[model samples]
Target chain A: SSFKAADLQLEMTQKPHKKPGPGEPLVFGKTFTDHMLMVEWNDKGWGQPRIQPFQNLTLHPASSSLHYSLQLFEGMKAFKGKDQQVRLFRPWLNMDRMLRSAMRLCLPSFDKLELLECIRRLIEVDKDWVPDAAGTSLYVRPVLIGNEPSLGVSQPRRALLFVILCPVGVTPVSLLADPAFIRAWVGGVGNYKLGGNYGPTVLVQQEALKRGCEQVLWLYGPDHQLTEVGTMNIFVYWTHEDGVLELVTPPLNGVILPGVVRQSLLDMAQTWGEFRVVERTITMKQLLRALEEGRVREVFGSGTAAQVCPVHRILYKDRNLHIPTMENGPELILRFQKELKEIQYGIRAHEWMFPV
Target chain B: SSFKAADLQLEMTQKPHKKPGPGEPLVFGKTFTDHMLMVEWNDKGWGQPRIQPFQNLTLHPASSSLHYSLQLFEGMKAFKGKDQQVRLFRPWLNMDRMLRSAMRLCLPSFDKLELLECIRRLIEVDKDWVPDAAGTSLYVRPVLIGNEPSLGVSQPRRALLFVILCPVGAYFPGGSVTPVSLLADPAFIRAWVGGVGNYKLGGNYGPTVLVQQEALKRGCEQVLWLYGPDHQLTEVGTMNIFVYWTHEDGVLELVTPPLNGVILPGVVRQSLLDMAQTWGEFRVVERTITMKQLLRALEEGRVREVFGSGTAAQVCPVHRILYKDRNLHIPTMENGPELILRFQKELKEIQYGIRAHEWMFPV
Candidate 1:
């Protein structure tokens, strides 16, 4: 609890290598910067947090993280402002959520601000790795692992929290909403950002791809309630029964992840005092009924990776329900995307963007 | 598909360490032997499997297996028979189940017989590590992991399959009807109808730990995992549960939860079913057994015996079932687990090569 800024020691690489140039398409999590922030946690509290060269970790073969999946990760981004300043989008939120995620796995909790400051220093030192492309930003991955050698089902006595940065290029969002593949459910650790959540979805995502869909729209239970997409939160803008325009996303009822962008978008919508904003269940049957009624306007997904992506189509029960992508008019989804991107890019004077 | 026994290479450890002398209490999976079998796999096929010094692994800071639970393992044992010969109990079944687990996580599969041959060699080399205790055997842990350096959820581009041996001691097993009280809480689910619970995946194991701890806290040794709103008894932590009751027609019935994509297809569960049906005692049924029906059976004094089946634990009787607010105590004297006790003895006989059978593989 008493960790401080000076406590985060810096260990630069003696031999610096050239950073990845923005010449071709950069994949997610594959390309890494030269430096990474590593810290060890044990009974003696946390060891000296050090920023060193990106390298492999020497681990005991029986580490709990590998065998038991006592691991969690946080995803946030850093952007290069037009004024040559580097900024992080709501980094404290990521740190806060990551600490919460760690708590689900019985991992050691650390000072959020202390870890944020270390990430700030990491981005400052590895500033050259930040991409300058119009759509690209520095992708930050903060991972926490249980490193104890014991194979018992007890709490992890040792852990490692490391931060790695990657330069990823943006891609348009397309979705496939099949009612079959359900990722997470109630009575499960679905709300937390756990490692076990993603591995199972990869197989589902592959199946979606085989059906010519880019992302998966998870439908829960026999009622076919729309939970979320691949990893992002789902939102739909439709005209209600009373003829009032409304925006709706699934409520956080222990199954849905409380995404930062989802919270931010909901907060922004409430502040603007728009038509109507609601957090409630949206079943596939209700969505298809609205689609048949010609009352649906736009659909989109929100996450840290793709700030806001317009979902164009939902391939459901032997049909492709086409949704508006804003190529025509009606800037509801586009306006939300533009507003969030403005805050993210420092176009608007907002406290969400932290200056590194 | 074309892999063979010759493809495996042997590189023995030069400095052999002292094996665990038949000392005091040996904790499960804590101590390992000196040598282990390690192999690598990548875009190319698997490399030559070798038995080398057992040590730590140097993995990437962003290894996918460390982040995602992209790992699976199998549990089997090698017994030192009366003739001092090492024998494995139906290792082909372990290899087959392990391959199915690999498919659940997108890991590549290999020839089961080929890997079984390599494990045979590894066991022969470290044959001295086999414990000589009665009912004890060498616990073999064969783990396959996704070692890809990238932090993506896709199929593993790199992986490792390693085997480690532990000299585990065993306890006496003639209790027959001496049973345990199971804590069956419906709010906490162990597996899902479509989830990866049936597989030997690591993630599936971790999620059950908390519930097991809670059961222990509630004066129970193990958790009886209940599923659905009907409180369908799924499993008892790592073991499979079976119930025996006398029906209204005066016919004895045996029931265990079916492998409905949730409960694991346990090896011991199958063996007991095979022997029970072969002996033609009762109707061995694989179906859902609700807690409400069990309560009614207890009220009618028809609950004969309840037991759990597993590899390490051949048969464990369940004397009390602490379901909801009711503490139902059943008598074990009149209702001894005669069938399961017989099955366990027969299994041990086949495993130790006492009853010369094809199930026991000589090493």
Candidate 2:
């Protein structure tokens, strides 16, 4: 088939707005940058990538994506290191996962290196959007969808892929200060960075907000086992009955999302070799039982955005499970956060940080 | 909350195109017109319906419908009558079905009458595109989709509804042709009427096409099935089945699968019953009958005519039934096909407004 790049035109937009306000905590995806990158794909091939101003897109009324729910996306972040250089944390890994997800949906796939290059180019064009505050970074969202015009149900040969960057402030300072917030679960699309995975959680998040909790503590299976905390991989450091300390997280039973930070933490914990680092199914019943026995010492969520978020308390099924108060608990979370930030900000050289 | 119709906009096409060639047989939904009708909806309300020029719709890379399979559509036809008057065969029914399908998909539903009116106006503008030849009509497709530009899987509060017309000729033209070739089995979603099977949702249709293509590869024209685990003959192909037979128990029955949530309540199936029963010829039974019963009747030589009915094919005879190694044969399939054509012609006369039938809705 003859490929025509001209047929797939790129429409660019210029951002008219300024940066975020000071002291504004870094939210995950609600904020936006000065520009975005978009490209269209048909049966032919991918269109030329465009660096455009961030704005609303006008779509056809009968586009297959709108009607058929043919949409998927990926979440990644870019950090500004201490050496005044922009860096991406394991971007190729995010690209690999996004490509796999596209294939699963029968969408077209291109070279991962090509996509990585495009992301770098896009970042270069909008370098000013990167937040400078501590804990604040540029959250990058990559999305793909079917855009065929026909109403007949079939795999759309035509598609579009776009990337948008949002300058998020620090993890909501207020949310971290609050004693409650829970999110994500098992037996769901939470394991994947697909669009279908996020929409259903919004209302649940709203409900948690109404109940004075920061987020949903997603429970799965009959046992209501604690899965990933919100959207990040969860970890708990608690003492076992034998008075031995064990750091645990839910096993990847085809349920929990394989987050990069989560994997990094497991690898780091294993290297420490001090505590019993275990990856196995831990049901809510077991957690409640452990809590009643005063075996639980600490709990936190691990992700790219927050590094390690402390679990002050978990609001589940009308009961709040409080973690033991310790003077060093908050400091432990801060320490891990600072360690990750140091590596990300190039304060300390780490293999995970790739300067772009 | 106060409702405002301020943002509703319509972009009309200045010119339309000619209809299809008279001799060309109509395919199901392959050929489309020069224009289309579209309307957008959000949490606020539906925008004004627009009749726009046919063109490709540009969409964001992250729209919800493409990824989550949040699509729904309706299939119907408009007939250009012998009287030179254009008519629609129970279009409101299609609208009703579309509304129900939208609701099931968690999409918004607006005034059905208003949508019907918009379609009628569209037809009025594009009436010249309706094929004039016999057995040919303009097939109307109304589709609704989740248009929210996000990476979320929940129900899209924002949606787009659009209708496009296609000129289609007869589905099966030959007289007393071979029984529809079918791949009969239990694996596929043949038709679970209660399980959104009756609703013409896009998800339900896309999954079936792959199976249909598989059947096509095996030299089969359609896929047949038994609904529950018991192998009850629920639906044959995309249409409702009509079985004419005399039971050995002395009861003369004209049977079709019941509207028991396992079979689509086809419009043609209903009309066949109404027209056939009006003649006081036989008893119309819409109920479940297992394949065992059908085979037994065939063995006893009590079977009369076994055929499928739908909008595409007014009626198609079933001469050969291929179930595993058993190839059940029906000798009177020729007569059954002839009778159906007769019924179809009668129905067409009413639809084209050539005959003074109360069923025709003229424009």
Candidate 3:
């Protein structure tokens, strides 16, 4: 039998107010709405999920998430469309990825459609929190944690899964690319959205900050193969040595994370029929060689945060490799960004958006 | 001005009773003492240390340690000697390494001697928990965690450091002790060469439990972690490995893996080297040895003994190793693991104050 959303309990916040006031910028992860979605797991099984008022949660100090990094999270957004209605941007993809991440961290898995329905109901109750302005929307964060109150290294007996919806502003598309940092590794749990993956990167990200860079262009192996940009998957557009133009991103190997935006761009480009698209390994050495031969066109990063961050220069081996401007006006990367945004905002109609 | 021990506030457990009852047997971490040492840190710097009654701590659900694996721990032991004198086995090494581990994980650091003094006072309060039986000692575990109750990945703004002590039984003595098989397959790595493998982290250990279960299915007890494409030996389960052989040059050689960031720089692993080289009975060496090299060396009858060393199980032998496609065996005479046994006895005598040494600190 399937778990049903009709079984969810509801508790609305007594204190509800305007979210993201007109002309007020959204500060990511700082702002919160009136209500949130949450659920718990004990030895017996998962309990009825609740859409309750936002507040602090009390837990034991020995919870496994703190000691062993047995936590994972998902990032998504809800947009206020032109038709005066709210909608989610490809929410099923986020739900699917979150289930996979929960499995990776040894957390209990929930039905994808059931969880998504809970999130949709959460947005419906706090529908006013969605910002109507362009580039401003309700940022939904789904976090899963193991909460066993024991002093050992194993899966938790109790667990907590939560979702926080907040109104936030858009991200400015830019990059200060530096390559001194290496993010994911082979045979490591890098392809997952586990909390262990994020905490360790902070130490290295601080080094990137000290070097006057916005984010690190993460590489792997002795060959300095391009893996990801900060938290996003990187894409490169260049003409091959054989003179055939191609847009390339690294394959979904054991190392690279499968980002939704990364796949969306490849899907959007294939329909355009302007250039050849390939999912292959892109190395720093090969990228530098293409730049030298004037075969490079544009380089950018794709993810949920920025949608697409244009990379103009990469500082590698203490030297800057400047990228050539795209020949088409307004940039090819910007075109893909608009295409995704149109589907999200309900401008040009698409099936990816789920109207609430 | 440094933090003083006199400032510590004590909380005695009113309901304290017999721990690990008669014939109940001590089960490692399952048993606990009456009191524990604790401290806290925030943006205002470190707070005064305290010795509190054993109790559950309340924290926010979004603590950083739970989500990011921002935790590390150190293990040390206290022994009861003849005439009921209590002594510690080189505790400063654990404190120093704990501080280093906290730094690597981006947690706050504290004064080594200050914390050690605090632990000493804690032991005095619960000295009855230390076992009087030979080889039975109080196993002390100091755990540190990051405790910011916010959703983000960065250095913590608030933290908690705590300790737990348990009375454990004696491990089996010498070559008569059970020897377990090992499992180390390629691509399922235990530690990376240049990463945070050197730290006493909890992230890598969780994965080991799964691999340990896999080995248990095949009748193996522990994992012999191998690294690099050539499959060089790194560590045996939680202990450092040692191999002795009669070389082609008619020289007795003792070998262990180097501290290449994948292995712990254990206090026992270091002390064993000092004892054997001084005796000149065998030539001590540290180098990488692959399974291929070890198999060939075994066939030549140069292999005399194989063992592992650590603080918990001081020394354990290796009798049967089920490698790929074949099973290799090391013959243990009516005598085996002689070098480790001799060192364990000499070290224990020194620890009990039967033979005075700088390593043992008496309370």
Candidate 4:
């Protein structure tokens, strides 16, 4: 009657997919594993969870997801340690955010630990897909969609939840800060991981690419305050006017997404107490002032795709604000990266990484 | 390689669907017809159009429509007159808007006239579904979705456009429609500038349902969406809003929000503006009206009537507005909403074929 891990059914794939070998050039979300996890829901309650062969979904033409953007998703990864043990870093955080997204989208709620356990078992069944290479991991995408076969713009009566695995590698990025575009606003659902938040940004991302920038530095409001970078949360390590070194990022106001990596970085920094860590609004003018004063030390983005992506340049208003992140080997950037990677790869035992 | 009506291929249904009989209870968009018009698009161009049995769609798990909300749609209707003729009212307007939405979503574009012709042919094929009742007609839904089997949030390489029909009853049941209550909450914004609020993208509609549900919970029938720090009135529950009032300068004016990237350019809104401008009875202006100004007018007893304009309902009257924790009663019906009745009469005459107009095209 409820979405429970105890009711999960498994249907193994007869023809397994070939795993990406060591040193293979992996493309993000290109190659998927052989099996997938799926569950259906209705007015009554959630149906049995099933692990079946990866296949196309047959949806009614009038499904609400096609007519209305009633969908949300989460991004997570599984790591293979040097000792050949599989692990997932802070999966409970992902499940927590996923449930929040589901609630915001009016989708059915599920047991977070139960869903995590199901994911753990799923990885155990297809453990071969977890790449052993240093820079590779299995990307897990959990998506929920409203599948009601009605035309009215109302609450969905039926829904579908599915998860797929893909072997992926990472790359760094540059940013384009444009004032003409806006990513989120007040009194909106930007805090949730709704599909609607991502689609409208593609055109702007293309514009950034045309301008020779790899990603967009999403701005908010008339002051052009920084909100996010591409699909990640932005961070700035700078010296304050009072001569205190502080790490600052936009607060989790309604317009910013609360990312797992973002929370982890803040946690690690606050625990170290080496510098002042603050979650506050940082505008372009203020940042430019800091850059002009030679107080900016390192700038980077945090997300699931790339743990700590170093931002080297930002194209803004006919001027390239070169971030000297790599000038001194990006000490703090590499520190955060090393901390996350060490915990993820089982080098340093911590509560964040859960052994499979 | 281009989308053309000449490339249409038809495969009629083996079994015809049973039509809804006269006086049978009808629901909006619940009962669909037998056949559907479908066409696919790729990098090269459009494929041959086909009319096949109504069925479910098989899509890849990673399709962009399911993941990134790469979808847009249009709403239309086919009316069957007492003369046993089926007509579509201002369908080209819908085609133009659909093309705009497709461009905004970065989907493939085609000849608007070609797509209209395809819709016309499909209507002719299922002409029996068009109801001849006074207030019943076939609801036409044209949906275009990103069919590319990928997870990347980019321009869709493959797209699908399909048209389906449903028999819908009148929005209001009785001969005299009841006025609706609206909740004007500035905390929940329906649209804003530099956003896709003007376009008919699926992303625009899905986020509003939650607000709509909230309105229902608060004992309101619709949401009077407000915008900006000044609380500018934008739209009323997916429809363009209009206010008839006596201004502070004592000029009688019918005002609606201008098409300044925040308002949807509704066909009904345009028709009413065109008709009112020709009458020269009152000044019809498209200008911004904030909640403060409107509240002042309401308190001074200068407000005449307020209503919403859309395709589903030609004109929905506003009776009461709940704003700032107070219910403001609007005397729309008591004020003799003569303009509303006249606009409805003129439009219904042209739509039902009683009056011959170029706006209605034969199916």
Candidate 5:
């Protein structure tokens, strides 16, 4: 009925990365390990899971993934700690989300636990490539694509699932909050991690770069309701009208992606019993009012990439709105980042990290 | 700066499909010809055009087309007419629209005429594949993809353009009109202003598959894509929609959605508009038709006919529309769809080379 982890076929590479030493520059998603995990889905069922040597994919020219955008992917990471232990940061969450994305595009579904086991085995084989450098981790990208060699825009009869690992450092980003572009919309598949959701935003992101901004603060509705910041979930820290300190992020409406980090931050803040954590709409008008009244403290984005990316400056309405995050030492931003990093790197020994 | 057809390289496939005999079942896009036309684009510029064997594409795992949906495609047809000559229908229009689709995804630009010339030569080499069966032709699909072997959401540094040919029969076998019923649900919107729906990008099509399935679940054949708060009829399935009705002001008119920001500029749509405007029998207006307005008109017995236009089926009649809890029946068949049949016949005449027209280009 579905692919089994027990049936995984392992093919080790002749050459491995050798685990580069400290001081090596690590770019995001550019470098890869020696091995990759793959599975093929046909009309019968999911085929045997294969952990093979990293290589190119030979696909039909008319594969629906290229012509009809029948594709989706997930981003995750594995960490190597000072104690020489390997860990994954809430990987089950990524599997759950990836299945939702697959359903949205009519791609074949697989057992989440089985796929996770396959990923765990692949990491076991390539554990040496996981960086021990502080704040550096191996990025795991699991991509699913419809490989049906036909042009019709229907359910994919054939599909492929592959996992690749990349070592990455991180970066904070600025934003351009313009109403001219929308990353997602109501009645659209923005909540899912579909490839369709990412491609169109590149053009607008390019426009933001041309305007001297790093990413886009996507807005929706005529009232300019803030949806997301680039590929991450956006959060705002400010004082409410009733003089209450609150952390607010746009609720999980149809337009907002249900990010893993977004969920973790909400859970962590609520557990700490800190200032009110509100999952509600924050329109540009409401945010501007708070900014003018000196009620806004910080604005940041949460994602698997950087964990918690502080927003220093946002260009809106032909003017730069300064976010006093770095000046304030970004208290909560650093706290969340440190908290997640501890669990990820096996420092705190939290349940969120799955040991290899 | 761009690819030139003058540098075309021909590589004959060791195996070619022996042109099948008559009455061989022809499925759309299922059977392909022997060869394909390909061109590669790197950070440098376009590579020399190549005509090689129809084969698989070896792409990097991080190729942006498979991950970011940085891909676009065009649909055209090559007809083998009574004169035993190959001709393409309004191919320049496809080229112009394809370039626009390419720009929307930041794909590199190309010389349209050079692409046309290359396609003409591709047809010349596979001329036998163009079936001579009355309504049979070779479907030409030109697909462009961002092949950059990196996982970044920026402009593609490497791209690939390939053209493949498939033999296809007519939409409805024999000479009959099988009308389609549509599910017009407001919960699903196909396109919106300030969105990429106007362009022929792959991203626009993938998400609609689930909605199309929903339509099927509701006992409908296709989706009547509605937009805006008023449920303005934008498109039917993947084709541009048309409505013939009498206005509240008592004037007979034929209307379709204008080429606004959300509406695709369809090739067959343009051809139909040109034909209707030239005939000038009734008012032909490019305007919005909301569900409320159309329902009111239908209740008042002013709605004449409804049809969709596209390259797959030149003109497809609509017999019923299921919106919300109501099933709005259309009288297209009851009215004999006189104008709809005429439009289909006239276009076929040109495509079959029975009536010579400038829109048909000899290969």
Candidate 6:
């Protein structure tokens, strides 16, 4: 059955918090607010949206999400801009991507604009929880799951959609500088925000931790071509064999996730048309060769979390290869971060920001 | 950690009546008895067994089995002999296979002998539920499921093992004069036994029901080929296949399931092997043959009796073939019902203590 937006009922929380703690780092997914927004969907229709006290969800023992890994989630953040106004950074894009993921998982899809409207209303109500701390914002997690109580393994006729808000900071500062960690690769579901895609990586991450590496360096194919680093699209600046500088990231050949931040960087770089920006298959052999030839310049990771992360040393084959920082102290990465933040915080006007 | 036998608990439920109604046709896995045996397992070790009243199980909503497809099951049966005694046919093999499947699916493996003891106690309690009605007996379902409550998708550290009883009748009753319709070349998992193939698993069953329904639409009652249609014979008539024929070497032989990674190691399969080997009747061989080979043999008039062997059907024959474009008939299929019934009666005699056989185990 088609999911209708009007079917949702909204129940606002009785008491909402209006303060952020000082000296607290902007943690990611750690501290939640007093309220949460949830809506249940079944074969019949969607239930009312309830902004209730944050509590544990009671589910049937036979829910499909628990058994078959039939669950999907989305990660977005609400930013408190410099103008003292609340804003959403390309929420419509996130909604559109989420709808596509839901359909692939055999779940019902709904009107994206209507869900966006609900999100806006949610942000408006919980505006005070938006932290003013730099690199800190309200992290939004939208999770959808199959909640049917049956032993039968089929497309679930019932589902639940809920959004939880957590006041958070950036990930471990060490992760931004640690090049030893790898995150995602080709022929993988690094793009889709599905639970099935995440569970398999936990073990890989644990193995990396055992080896004293912070995260996984998701390499793809026999050539070990690097894809994304630590849940973010990787960017590398290196001189080509033709002696021309090129900025490159892995091409989205259905493997690399089309991250929103990655897209924004590409769009801004294309508009500026400053240096040669290429999105193609970059092999590890070519990268290593370039590094050996003194052609490798700087490397970084981009995502919603860090904006831009500068890599220090990459641990490969029991060897620590240090990257030479740019003249302006990681100049390219720092500039990209400044440009994106300026657009996000309303310091520079752009088409990406939505004032609510 | 190794599964300890002494930790298992056995409970029993005794039945009052030992007879069946005359008009009631033997059904497969639809009826049950008064008692069941069950146990729980975790990373620590296997739990004590409990023989309790047959009832519905209530589980937490977040249990692993419900969500992660982390459940496996087995189908086995016990016969009530003409001598008024009950005997189990190859119960230990089932226990061994179940334990291996449990380990692979990250469930618990327990003491095989203890499991047998529990099965015996349960059967002893509900001995009357074993129907003496011709072509009908007690079917046992051994199920294992992960029962942890967390939302993670890894193997559950906790599991539940239980046995349920059902009274089953003849799978194909009015003689195997007609062959069941079958859907060949389905893109579903019939048995990737090497990839969890040897183990009896529930995940293997649920996906086939839709294909079974598809076969029904084509006027077929059962799913004939579990994997391929080119005589890559997987499951035939809810059982394993046994074909008697002359090989290219001019040797008259009995052909059955190959130990291909995909076929289930059926107890009935082993029994056929034992029966054929003991009598020195024919050269029994387990080998792989394509559908073309079987069809070629059918045309040559060399293909003798072809039947399916399993815990359910015992022995069922294929009367007709719905292949790629044509339907071939086997004249010998008409004689299958009589011969299979005779074989079943012979097996039942040993099971019920009427005929003494080394294979039967008395509780």
Specify the highest-DockQ model's number. Answer: 5
* Candidate 3, CAPRI quality class derived from DockQ: acceptable
Computed on alpha carbons, the lDDT of every model, listed in order, comes to 0.81, 0.68, 0.76, 0.88, 0.89, 0.66
Candidate 1, clashing residue pairs? none
Residue A351 C-alpha lDDT in model 3: 75
- Models ranked on DockQ: 5, 4, 1, 3, 2, 6
In terms of lDDT, the poorest run of 10 residues in model 4 chain A is A19-28
* 1 or 2, greater by DockQ: 1
Q: TM-score: which candidate is best?
A: 5
lDDT of each residue in A1-356, candidate 4, tens digit only: 55888899999999777767666666568788888899999999999889899999999888989998999988988999889999998899999999888887777888888888888888888888888777778888889999998998888999999998888872456799988777777888889888888878988988999999999999888898999998899999999878999999999888899999999999999999988999999999988998899999989998888678888899989799988788847889888877888888888999898888
State the weakest 10-residue window (summed lDDT) of model 1 chain B.
B170-179
Q: lDDT tens digits, residues B80-150, model 1?
A: 98788999987888998999988878887888988899899999988988886667888888888888877
Task: List residue ranges in candidate 2 displaced over 4 A.
Answer: A1-17, A21-35, A38-62, A169-343, B1-12, B25-30, B41-46, B55-72, B89-97, B100-109, B132-135, B145-159, B173-363
- The regions of model 4 sitting more than 4 angstroms off are A170-172
Clashes of each: 0, 36, 4, 0, 0, 33
lDDT of 2 by residue, A201-233 (tens): 444555566767775555655566667666667
- Residue-by-residue lDDT tens digits, candidate 5, A250-296: 99878999998999999899989969998999998898888888888
Candidates sorted on TM-score, descending? 5, 4, 1, 3, 2, 6
Each candidate's fnat, listed in order, reads: 0.59, 0.25, 0.39, 0.69, 0.81, 0.02
Docking quality (DockQ) of candidate 1: 0.64
lDDT of 1 by residue, A1-356 (tens): 43566877877888877677667667777888889998988877778899999888888777788777888888899988677788998888888889888777778888898889989999999998887667788889999988887656667788898888888762345677776566776887788888887777777888888888898888888888999988889988899777889899999987798999998988899899977999999998888888889888878888888677777788888798877656424467668767877777777789888998
Error of 3 at B76 (Å): 2.3
Error of 6 at B131 (Å): 1.3
Q: Write the per-residue lDDT of candidate 2 for residues B57-146, one digit (tens) a residue.
A: 554444456545567777777899766788888777787778777766677767777777777777887788898776778888788777
Give interface RMSD, per candidate: 1.6, 7.4, 2.9, 1.0, 1.0, 8.1
Considering every candidate listed, which one attains the maximal lDDT? 5
Model 4 error, position B346 (Å): 1.0
Per-candidate DockQ vs. reference = 0.64, 0.17, 0.41, 0.76, 0.81, 0.09
